[PDB]
Structure formats: C-alpha cells, structure tokens
C-alpha cells in the first residue's frame, strides 16, 4: 500500500536504492519537532499514505516519544528502525499504534542469566542506581531465579541513593564479595561508580562486571574507566545494515495488510489532514513470519525473536563483539573464557595451574554431564578432553565432562587453603609416562615440557 520511508541520517544513505502499493523514499538531516510535524502534515496530504518507516542517526530518545504521540493522534502505524527513534521505551499505549524493533530489559536480562549459567558463575550480587525502571528489573530477576535449575547464590541488592558521597555508600560497596556483579546505571554515573570501585580495589580479574545495553552508549565514546573486559549486550548488529531492517519492515507491513484484507477489505485508513476507527492492524500482526524469519510481536509491542549481541572491551579499548543470539538458545564464538588479565596498565594478575590427570578408578572418575540440567553435580568438577573424531584426521573436540574420586578430593581441599586457581583437563596422549628414546609421554610429557604445572593423579 501507500508507505512512506523517511530516514534521518548523517551516514550517506542515498535514495535511489530505496493491488495498490506505492513507496515513498526521502532523506532528512534535521530532527527538530516542528520539522517532524510539518513533514508529517505535508505528506499526509500526499495521496493517503498509510505506512511510515522511520530511522534516526542521532541518539535522542524524544523522537520516538513524539512519533508515538503523533501516531496516536493520527491513528497511523509507525516503526522504529535506528537511533533514538528505535530505542525501546517504557510502556506503550493501546490508543497508540507505534511499534519498534529490539528487545526490552527483561529479554536482555534472561540472555545475561543464560550467559552466566553457561560459565557456572553461580555467586553474584545486585547493584542498582536510582535510574528509573530498576524495580521491574529486580522483580524479574527475583521471579527468574526461583524457577531455575541452577540455585543461584545472590548477595543482598546494592541500591544507590544519590551521587555517592563515599561516606555510607562505600559501606555497602565493601560488602560486595562476589566475583560476578550486576550493574544497572546510566553512562554518566558508570564512570563515577567504576572509578570509585577501582579506588576500592574491587577491579580485579575475578571481579567481573555485567551491564545492560543502557550503559553502553556511543561506540566512539569510550570512557577510560571501563576495564578491558566489561560485559555488555546491545542489539546493535553490525552485520545487518539498515537496508535489511527497512526491507523487513516493508515485508511485515505488506504481510499484515494482505492478511487483514481478507477478513475486512477496508482496513488501510489514514486521517485526511492535521487541521480541522474500527478495524486496523492494531491487534492483528501479533503473529507474522516472512521468509522463515519470525518477525512476530508481543502484546506490548516488543519483538519475539530479536537480534542481541554480546560485546566486551578488548585491550585496545574497543567494544568487541563476541556472542550472538540464536532463535532461543545462546551461541558463543569463544567457548573457553579469556582471562582478560590486563584491564589497565596497573594490573599484574598472575595465578593459575594447568592440571592434567589420568582416569584412575577410585581417584579420577570420568562421568558424563547430567542432561536434565546440563550441569555437573556439585560434588564433581569441570574438565575437558580433546576427543578426536576419526582416525584419518587429527581434528578433535573438547568435550566437557565431570570428574570425581578420591584424589580429586585432595585438589579441592588444597585450593581451599593455598587459594589458587586451576583449569582441570585430561591427557589425550596416553598413560602416565614412558621415556621412549628420551621422549616422554602423558603427564611427564606435560610437566617436563611445561605445558602443564602439576598432576594430582596417582603416580609412582
């Protein structure tokens, strides 16, 4: 049908590449509200356009607010594609017909807890600022933990009152003793809080920090107080350009209109003019899928299967994209977690013991992971084995299993006192050790060659 595609961009996106279907293509630079109202009222006199696809290059979130308001006052559906206009707002209104793209806070929180589970970081806390929308996050986390297979260890929630005086706020900041910390704050407060924590010394390698997409602002704007290795997830997928986004929006609109035509023919209706409703797409495009991609929405307007991306801060002070999001699952390009020991130039982190053992009946019991919860039972320990696939090729897979026995009891108690760290694994070369023409093998081949450190397994 009559659809208008308006783009407010600084990036050079030209226009020529952009029963009764007509499309409108325009390029806009300014973003002042009077210009928006004037353009909307001018195009509304242009041959009864029902479709409006908008994106923005700036990072101002009031544009989406004004777009939703004008859509409500004109009863015309509007989309958000990029920039502040595509930012997910708090609570839409049934009177409004404005819809967006990207996920809300709850979906991203679920993704974050999935990421935490996939690395077995079961001890954490909760740090929240006075930023609005924190109580919904708290309630969602409380509801999510109580119906989980993990049994997470949660410390008391840290809530800030004002710009921290470092008089009573530091009292709460000291009690944070976990390794994983969850922070929910704006970008301006993040620099202050992170500098405060770095002065408090809670900026160690094990003190991981996780924040939502809110605190990760401009890709170019990167404060120096963010340690190299901050955990962030934002829906900014750079492999998919805005052209695909607007094409998918056109597909959504065409499918919705085509499917709503048969139930009632006279659905597409736009208001006559700015100066001077029974059947619509308001409650109809809940279910929709184009070219396999399920582009369905929720009852509150959100997406069903968004595109979230896991990003971290490399040593080069850049947001490094790592993990994406599948239809429901979570993929990880880097299965083994990098240490990121160098957050800054004042952090000489050094402590870890490569331990290689061999399967011995009463000491090293190798058992498969429990499929019911996909987690090793608490009295076992993580491990891996480079298991070759075929005999023609040397390629193999690092299958992760669970180890127990009698000697493994010794290793656990040693870390309790000496307070060190280990990365347990199994020898694929073979038996304990045999000097084959002045060439060893197995554990001796892993300590003499210094590929490992110690071997808790039984040895003669």
């Amino acid at each position, epitope marked *: 049908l*009559n659809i208008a595609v308006l783009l407010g961009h600084s990036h050079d996106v030209t226009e020529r590449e952009l*029963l*009764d279907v*007509n499309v*409108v293509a*325009l390029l806009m630079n300014r973003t002042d509200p009077k210009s928006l109202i004037t353009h909307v009222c001018d195009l509304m*006199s*242009g*041959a*009864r356009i029902h479709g409006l696809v908008f994106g923005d290059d700036t990072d101002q979130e009031a544009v989406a607010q004004m777009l939703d308001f004008i859509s409500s006052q004109t009863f015309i559906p509007i989309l958000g594609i990029h920039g502040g206009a595509s930012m997910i707002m708090a609570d839409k209104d049934p009177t409004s017909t404005f819809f967006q793209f990207g996920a809300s806070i709850q979906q991203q929180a679920t993704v974050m807890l999935k990421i935490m589970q996939d690395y077995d970081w079961h001890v954490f806390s909760l740090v929240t600022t006075i930023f609005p929308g924190y109580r919904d996050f708290i309630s969602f986390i409380k509801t999510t933990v109580d119906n989980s297979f993990v049994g997470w260890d949660m410390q008391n929630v840290i809530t800030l009152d004002t710009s921290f005086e470092d008089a009573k706020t530091q009292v709460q900041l000291k009690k944070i003793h976990s390794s994983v910390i969850l922070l929910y704050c704006s970008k301006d407060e993040a620099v202050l809080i992170l500098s405060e924590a770095r002065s408090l010394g809670l900026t160690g390698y094990d003190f991981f920090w996780i924040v939502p997409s809110l605190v990760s602002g401009n890709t170019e704007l990167i404060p120096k107080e963010f340690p190299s290795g901050l955990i962030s997830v934002s829906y900014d997928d750079w492999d998919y350009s805005l052209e695909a986004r607007v094409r998918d929006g056109l597909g959504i609109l065409t499918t919705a209109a085509s499917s709503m035509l048969e139930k*009632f*023919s*006279y659905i597409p*209706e736009a208001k*006559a003019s700015c100066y001077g409703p*029974l059947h619509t797409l308001h409650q109809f495009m809940v279910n929709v899928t184009w070219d396999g991609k399920d582009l369905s929405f929720t009852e509150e307007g959100y997406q069903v299967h968004p595109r979230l991306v896991v990003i971290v801060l490399n040593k080069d002070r850049e947001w490094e994209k790592v993990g994406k999001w599948e239809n429901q699952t979570l993929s990880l390009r880097h299965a083994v977690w990098p240490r990121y020991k160098s957050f800054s130039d004042c952090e000489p982190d050094d402590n870890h013991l490569s331990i290689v053992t061999l399967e011995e009946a009463p000491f090293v019991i190798v058992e498969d992971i429990d499929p019911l919860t996909e987690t090793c039972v608490r009295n076992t320990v993580p491990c891996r084995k480079f298991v070759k696939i075929n005999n023609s090729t040397n390629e193999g897979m690092n299958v992760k299993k669970c180890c127990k026995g009698f000697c493994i009891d010794i290793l656990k108690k040693l870390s309790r006192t000496v307070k060190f760290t280990y990365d347990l694994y199994l020898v694929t070369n073979g038996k304990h050790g045999k000097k084959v023409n002045n060439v060893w093998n197995g554990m001796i081949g892993e300590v003499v060659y210094q590929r490992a450190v110690m071997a808790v397994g039984s040895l003669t």
Partner: antibody
Amino acid sequence: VQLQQSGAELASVKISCKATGYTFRSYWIEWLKQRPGHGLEWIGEILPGSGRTNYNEKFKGKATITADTSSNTAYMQLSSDSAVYYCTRSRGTMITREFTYWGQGALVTV
Amino acid sequence: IVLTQSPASLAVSATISCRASEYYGTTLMQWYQQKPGQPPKLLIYAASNVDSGVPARFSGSGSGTDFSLNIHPVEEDDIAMYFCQQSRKVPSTFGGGTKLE
C-alpha cells in the same frame, strides 16, 4: 467494470450509481458537476467499505452522499443548480488520482 | 490551484499551453480529450508518460508551473476540446477548454 445511473429529473432529488464490475467495498466513489459553459467541478468522495466521507467547502451543506453495501449503489442528495452529473472511479493504482471509468449522466433542471 | 490556458479557440489546417498557479520529482498534470456528447478520455499522465493503447503521434513535456502539449502529424481525431487537471492538492481542478478546426 461498467457503471449505471438513474434517469432524468425535473425541491430535492436523488441519483443512484450502481457498480457491477468489481468488489464495491474497496474503491472510493467521486461526484462531478459539469454545468455547460465551463470544464468541471468536484463535490466529494465516499468509501463504501468504512463509510468515511469528505466534502468540498463550496458544496458543503448542500450535497449529502450515502452508499448501500448490500445493493452496491451510491446515493447523492442535493437539498433546497441545473447541471449534468457524473459518478466515477479511479483505476486504483493511486497517487495519480485520475478518472478513468465514467457514468452515463443525469440531467437535472429546475 | 487555479488553471488558465490559451487560446480558447485554435485555427489549424498545432500546440496547446496550460500554465499553473511537482511532487518530489513527479509532475502532476493530465490531459483529457472529450468529443461532443461523449465522456472524457485520459491521454497523458505524469506530464511525460503516454497512455497505452493510444497513437504515438501524441507527445508532451513540461515542468514547474508551465506545461505544454503538441501533436504531430495532424489528423481528423484531434477535433475535440481539451483541458489540463492538477492533483497536487485536493480538490482537483480542470482547464477552460480549447476547440480545434
């Protein structure tokens, strides 16, 4: 697609415009006045599917347009002017807003 | 929008002009041919594209508020009145008519 209308007239009157070539609930219907001595005018449009109606300021308050979804007919009532009348429909591709299908014409006189 | 065209009557054995008082690169002007006692027939749309099923002898051009129409070669068919219609703003309006002989 073909159109038919009422007969001649000679107070108030009503003129019918019946559709027998398409789905009558999808396209707008426009009324035109073609009083001899000049080109033409424009009165208003009506959508049978939803019933939304718009009128011209010059003819506002004098012409009332109504439609019946059952018999697929268009009714335009002038109250309390002798000119030839036409009811027409656009092609549907939109934007151009041109007139392609034309009626027969009802000649009213006082 | 108010339209005005000259001459009111034309004597040939030709061209037409229609001056107005564009929509993002698109011109909105149409020319209609109306024989006596017959409904109008659309001839040119978008001020540059002819209608399918019509003789190729017709061609038109124009932009802004000054547009013109010319015909060649001359035959018996172009013996009716003509007008120009705008669609940039509702309601539409037509021309003043132009005979031929």
